[PDB]
């Protein structure tokens, strides 16, 4: 048969499944329209989007990853699925939206990139308003009830941070990262993305991650340790105010989890002392991880 025809085949029998091997189903539907054929991809997004409505948590999470895997091969495509995203981030099961809060950290960079590089249609400042939203709902979730869902939130602030901020010539960025977009390539005049929002915003979103800091559980601490540590090295006009964190965190949990606390402190630390960046604050970054106990060859060991 045609690749549409066994498309057509295999999602008629998904829609009739009635467990989980729906989702065998749907994955050889995905690699027949993303990966045999692409050109179907556009074709069949209803069809698959439909099965959002599932009462299964793993058939939920295969759309939301779908919708990651859609615009991964056409942006364009966001027009169409972000409100549909926008339904599973709001989920009331609380791995559908971890999931979705994953999909949202790898698109909105892509997005914004899509936006900047566009001339800007009514559709893509509809998804714009959309998307923006959408990140900021993930900043509030910072104060989610669910542990693991703060974990996956700071990591998607850390992501909003980095790209709503300049690259620096002294910016140490992941091989993985090179090609993310971040705020100074974002031009001052576009007609529809305003600069002094995105970079107020990125301000921002670093405000709350700091606050969040003093609200949370051992290891949300410890990623938003980690999260600042490479917000530091990745964009260090924010040296100071991680450092300050830094320091904040350490005058003022249980107690039995201060030893490990402490440990990945001095960790992340070090990581920043070692970054070039570090020698405005060489004083004070020397002070603190004495206070927290360091010994002097640790130190000098991890100078830039």
Not at 277 to 291: G, K, N, R
Request: hydrophobic share 45%.
């Amino acid at each position: 048969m045609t690749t549409s025809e066994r498309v057509v085949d295999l999602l008629n029998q998904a829609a009739l499944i009635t467990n989980d091997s729906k989702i065998t189903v749907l994955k050889q539907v995905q690699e027949l329209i993303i990966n045999k054929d692409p050109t179907l991809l556009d074709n069949f997004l209803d069809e698959i989007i439909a099965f959002q409505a599932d009462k299964s948590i793993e058939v939920r999470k295969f759309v939301i990853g779908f919708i990651e895997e859609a615009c991964k091969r056409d942006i364009e495509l966001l027009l169409k699925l972000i409100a549909n995203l926008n339904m599973l981030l709001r989920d009331e099961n609380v791995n559908v939206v971890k999931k979705a809060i994953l999909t949202m950290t790898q698109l909105y960079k892509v997005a914004l990139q899509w936006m900047v590089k566009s001339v800007i249609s009514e559709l893509q400042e509809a998804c714009w308003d959309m998307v923006s939203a959408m990140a900021g709902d993930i900043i509030l979730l910072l104060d989610s009830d669910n542990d693991g869902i703060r974990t996956h939130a700071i990591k998607f602030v850390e992501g909003l941070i980095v790209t709503l901020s300049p690259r620096m010539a002294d910016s140490e960025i992941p091989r993985r990262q090179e090609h993310d977009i971040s705020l100074d390539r974002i031009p001052r005049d576009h007609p529809y993305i305003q600069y002094n929002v995105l970079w107020e915003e990125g301000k921002a979103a670093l405000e709350q991650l700091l606050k969040f800091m003093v609200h949370i559980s051992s290891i949300n601490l410890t990623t938003a340790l980690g999260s600042l540590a490479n917000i530091a090295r990745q964009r260090p006009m924010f040296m100071s105010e991680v450092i300050q964190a830094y320091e904040t965190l350490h005058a003022n949990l249980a107690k039995s989890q201060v030893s490990s606390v402490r440990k990945n402190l001095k960790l992340h630390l070090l990581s920043v002392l070692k970054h070039p960046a570090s020698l405005e604050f060489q004083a004070q970054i020397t002070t603190l991880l004495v206070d927290l106990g360091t010994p002097q060859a640790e130190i000098a060991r991890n100078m830039p």
